[PDB]
Amino acid sequence: GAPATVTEQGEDITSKKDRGVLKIVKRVGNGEETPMIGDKVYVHYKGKLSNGKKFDSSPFVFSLGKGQVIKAWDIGVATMKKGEIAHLLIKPEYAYGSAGSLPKIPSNATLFFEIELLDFKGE
Numbered sequence: 001g002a003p004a005t006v007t008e009q010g011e012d013i014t015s016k017k018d019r020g021v022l023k024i025v026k027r028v029g030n031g032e033e034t035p036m037i038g039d040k041v042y043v044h045y046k047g048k049l050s051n052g053k054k055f056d057s058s059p060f061v062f063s064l065g066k067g068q069v070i071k072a073w074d075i076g077v078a079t080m081k082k083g084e085i086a087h088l089l090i091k092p093e094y095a096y097g098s099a100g101s102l103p104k105i106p107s108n109a110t111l112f113f114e115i116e117l118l119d120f121k122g123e
């Protein structure tokens, strides 16, 4: 499954190289430029828990690197070009950790997302 391909062949995009955020590009974007901390970002995504028990999907907007999303998003989206689509697999430490966000997210949950980056302007 899409998840498994990531956790076998997926690029480790953490600074610490702790494999906590793994990424595959599924469709390539256009331009050299990827967004900077503080940009307004516009994406479509779908998402699931590894548990298979909860699913979620978006025109989703957030300010990159401003902590409005999970650390994995701030890391993962910043590596994306306009019009790109990618798969992120994420360990709990770059998501909702040991505490989780009950009841939606349990303790120590792993997450998978599919993300298309549409546009980012400056703030």
Ligand SMILES: COc1cc2cc(OC)c1OCCOCCOC(=O)[C@@H]1CCCCN1C(=O)[C@H]2C1CCCCC1
Binding pocket: 045, 047, 048, 049, 054, 055, 056, 068, 069, 070, 073, 101, 104, 105, 111
């Ligand atoms: C529908 O809105 C949610 C989507 C997700 C998690 C949420 O809260 C835990 C949600 O409810 C509260 C609002 O979002 C808070 C931030 O959520 C996030 O940072 C990440 C990254 C951006 C997409 C939304 N995110 C989510 O974690 C989803 C999860 C994805 C896994 C299945 C359950 C829902």
